[PDB]
Design a protein around this ligand. Sequence first.
Ligand SMILES: [Mn+2]
Length: 245
Amino acid sequence: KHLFLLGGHDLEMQTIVQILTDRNVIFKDRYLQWDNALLSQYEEEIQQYGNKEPFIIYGVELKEDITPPTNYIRIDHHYPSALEQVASILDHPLNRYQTLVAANDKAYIPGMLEIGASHEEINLIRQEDRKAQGVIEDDEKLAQEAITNGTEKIGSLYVVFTTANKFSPICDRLYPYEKLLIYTPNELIYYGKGINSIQKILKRYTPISNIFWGGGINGFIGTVRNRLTTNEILNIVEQIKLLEL
Ligand SMILES: [Mn+2]
C-alpha cells in the first residue's frame, strides 16, 4: 500500500497529483509551497503509517527536517525528475505534455527546446507553470503593460518598472535576455550576467540577510520585499544602469 506525501506546488507537482489520481494512488496534498515544503507538516501521517509494515511512504520534494521513518522513500532532484521517478514507480508512460513538464522543470525553456517543443507548447507550459506557482491574472496583465509602457533598454540591460507582485510573467515574455532588472516601489530583482557586481551595490545598502541569490546561467539576485525603502531602490536602479555607463 503506497502513500505519497506531496511538497511544493509547481507544474510538476500538479502533474504528479493528476497521475496519482488517475492511477488511484493515495496521496496527501497539504497545498504546500517551497517556503514550507517540510516533512514535518505530515507528522500526522508519519505517525499513522510510519514504521508500519504494509505501507511505503514516498516523499516528493519534501525537506527532511524531522527523522524519516524506515518505510520512507525520498523522491527529489539531484538524473530523473520527480515526475519521471513517480512515473517509473507507477509504470506510467509519459505523454507529450508530461515530457514537456519534466523538461521545463529540469531546464526551463532550453530543456523544452531540446525535446523539440513548438513555440505554442512552450507558451502553454510557461503559462501553466506560472498558474501552478500562484501567479494571478493581474500580474500577467501588469507584465504586459510593464513591458509595453515601462521598459527601457540601456546597454544590454533591460530595465522594467512594474507594480506586479510576481515577476515570472515578465521574465518569460522577455526571454531570451542577457540582463534584466525588474523593480517595484517595494523590491528589485536582477536577472542575468554579472550578479557579483550587483552584489557589491546591494551591500552598500542592506545586510546580506535581506539579499537572495542563485548562481548560473539562470542566475538572479534580489532584495526581500519592503526591506529597502523606495528611495534606496531608485538609487540602486540608477547605479546598476551606470554599470552600462
Ligand atoms: Mn522538480
